[PDB]
Amino acid sequence: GLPVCGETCTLGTCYTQGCTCSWPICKRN
Numbered sequence: 782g783l784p785v786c787g788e789t790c791t792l793g794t795c796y797t798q799g800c801t802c803s804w805p806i807c808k809r810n
Contacts, residue, residue, distance in 0.1 A: 790807045
């Protein structure tokens with residue numbers, strides 16, 4: 782529930798842990 786992954790998910794991928802694709806970024810917990 783926090784977009785503190787520091788990655789964008791416009792491509793539909795996230796390398797960060799527990800991070801979920803939340804266009805255009807990634808959100809973990």
